[PDB]
A paper describes a structure:
In the absence of folate, two different FAD-bound tMTHFR structures with different intermonomer interfaces have been described. In one of the structures, only one active site in the dimer is occupied by FAD (half-FAD occupancy, dimer mode 1) while both active sites are occupied in the other (full-FAD occupancy, dimer mode 2). It is worth noting that tMTHFR purifies in the half-FAD occupancy state; only the addition of excess FAD leads to the observance of the full-FAD occupancy state. In contrast, in the folate-free tMTHFR structure, the distance between Thr and Glu is found to be 5.7 Å, suggesting that the triad expansion to include the interacting Thr49 and formation of a tetrad is triggered or is coupled to binding of a specific folate form. Indeed, the Thr coordination in the folate-free tMTHFR structure is very similar to that in the eMTHFR structure with or without CH3-H4folate. It has to be noted that while the Thr residue exhibits a dynamic behavior, the positions of the Ser, His, and Glu residues in the triad remain largely unchanged.
Numbering used by the authors:
A (entry chain B): 1 to 110, 117 to 291
B (entry chain A): 1 to 291
Write the structure that this text describes.
Amino acid sequence: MKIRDLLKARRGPLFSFEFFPPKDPEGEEALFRTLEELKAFRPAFVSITYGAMGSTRERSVAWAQRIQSLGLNPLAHLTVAGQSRKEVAEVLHRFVESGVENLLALRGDPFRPHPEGFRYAAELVALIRERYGDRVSVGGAAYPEGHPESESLEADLRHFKAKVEAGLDFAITQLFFNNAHYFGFLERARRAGIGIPILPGIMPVTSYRQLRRFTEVCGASIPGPLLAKLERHQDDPKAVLEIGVEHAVRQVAELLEAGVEGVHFYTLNKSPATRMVLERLGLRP
Amino acid sequence: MKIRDLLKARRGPLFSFEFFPPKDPEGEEALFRTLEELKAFRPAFVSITYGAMGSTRERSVAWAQRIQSLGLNPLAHLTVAGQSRKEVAEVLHRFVESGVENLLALRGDPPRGERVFRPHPEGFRYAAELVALIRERYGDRVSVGGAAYPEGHPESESLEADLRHFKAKVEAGLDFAITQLFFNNAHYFGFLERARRAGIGIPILPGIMPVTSYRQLRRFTEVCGASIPGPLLAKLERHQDDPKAVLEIGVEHAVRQVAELLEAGVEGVHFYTLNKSPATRMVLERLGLRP
Ligand SMILES: Cc1cc2nc3c(=O)[nH]c(=O)nc-3n(C[C@H](O)[C@H](O)[C@H](O)COP(=O)(O)OP(=O)(O)OC[C@H]3O[C@@H](n4cnc5c(N)ncnc54)[C@H](O)[C@@H]3O)c2cc1C
Ligand SMILES: Cc1cc2nc3c(=O)[nH]c(=O)nc-3n(C[C@H](O)[C@H](O)[C@H](O)COP(=O)(O)OP(=O)(O)OC[C@H]3O[C@@H](n4cnc5c(N)ncnc54)[C@H](O)[C@@H]3O)c2cc1C
Ligand code: NA
Ligand code: NA
């Protein structure tokens, strides 16, 4: 089912999970195990990421199909970096010919475009709509704290708006650790005339180091209390997992009481954190 | 001049500096040096903090008097913690008697180590009650400000409660507010759009702290609830043992922040100086704002 329709039909929240194409047999087995655990929560959709320059193209397709084989509804990510327009179009056709009806149109990271490539995710959005109309549902990235490369936050929101207007049905946010970042962004988007659902992206912390590297790359901020607490227990993995889960639970309880349309979980191909968050919220069907 | 009137009269930004009353001659000499340096930037006001439970209230009055006599325009902070209503009204009166016409009404914090705030048995519980007192007694003859928390106050049950409590505080009779420190302008802009959508129309001035010490940043944000951008955090952490590199990183970060707030047309910027001149000077110099 197209996410655009799920969002209107379902009055309770959509839970989604994000996974990446593992790069070796061991990784693949780990993801299969993670899938077997998380599918019992009956996610509204499951995303499969795409290597920035087209490096995972085959594996992304194969995992999209595998998600379908489990009875789950894939959201297929697709990037424009490092690919001709024709390459991007070919991969897109292969997703669509597989029965994938949900795409997440992204730029990807290296930034100079491919000589016959696109420059912006909005050009892929426009491609998809030009070729497939409403036969698919298209999402894009949003950055509550602003994309690192944007000259200003005003330009960031304007650029996001242009992307929406290319034909987005929904957006998924970059990770954030204080719900104020999300609600702020949401209000600013609405003031800018944007009406599409915008789903909060949540990463439950399972490792101090990982938190540090992720926020460093993507530009997200960490609350001072959370940082201190993680820093103290950084050497006790069980404590860290506990602290991350508690924090995501606090985050997600408020998002749901506020009426968000769904929550997208960055799982990093592991089940425990996401499982614990959902079980603590009373959300195991 | 009332900050209420400066904000309406002036179409460009107000610049303001926050200072704390030093405890001793050495601290006083240091602040007078900082003041001498920073007064060149011609701030529209200068704020003087108040020690949470009133034990240093006469230092706060003395510094308000010093600032007023230096031709600078004091914004006197005042808390309700650990003090009776009478005690609070007495200090309030002294400020006004000394010519102060701008007050920042605050709750104050319980002692370090205590997690429950409990009012004085005959004191106020919320800043809003101080606001109401001020207006009851002085009407519009003074200008009254409050605090705002773009990332939500650590004690608020939710961000929705946070905003509703802020709105009630505004409605008790605020002319402006100043934010808690923040390190990404998205936090400030988001809060503004939330406040507006809640029907708050007072000017809300961003509060900026230029980072001069890794460990201080960590403690302040641990206490405040504020967040640190991952890139900034990464850089400061790498260089935390070189104070000059930290100062340069903190200055550069604040320059980027302030440059965007001014271009967006904020009504001013309030600097948390911690009684030091170098970082704030450098920020403003680099923006070309030395007259
Ligand atoms: C939910 C989610 C999933 C992701 N999945 C993947 C993935 O599978 N693979 C991957 O490689 N990356 C992925 N990313 C990351 C993404 O590719 C990077 O964040 C990338 O740097 C930006 O992609 P975008 O589509 O958000 O960019 P765009 O919307 O193209 O924006 C890129 C930059 O250009 C600016 N810009 C936009 N339009 C204009 C314009 N008209 N003029 C000038 N500047 C403009 C933007 O403000 C930004 O600075 C994901 C991100 C999110 C939030
Ligand atoms: C610019 C600035 C300057 C400051 N200067 C000083 C200073 O000089 N001295 C000092 O000691 N502290 C100072 N503070 C810190 C301040 O005292 C603390 O943040 C304190 O914890 C809260 O004070 P407040 O006036 O913001 O609180 P209030 O507005 O009283 O709010 C306190 C808490 O109770 C909640 N609340 C408010 N109204 C209600 C209600 N009716 N019912 C239920 N809950 C409610 C709030 O949401 C919050 O959770 C300053 C803060 C800022 C931003
Ligand atoms: Na819905
Ligand atoms: Na003004």
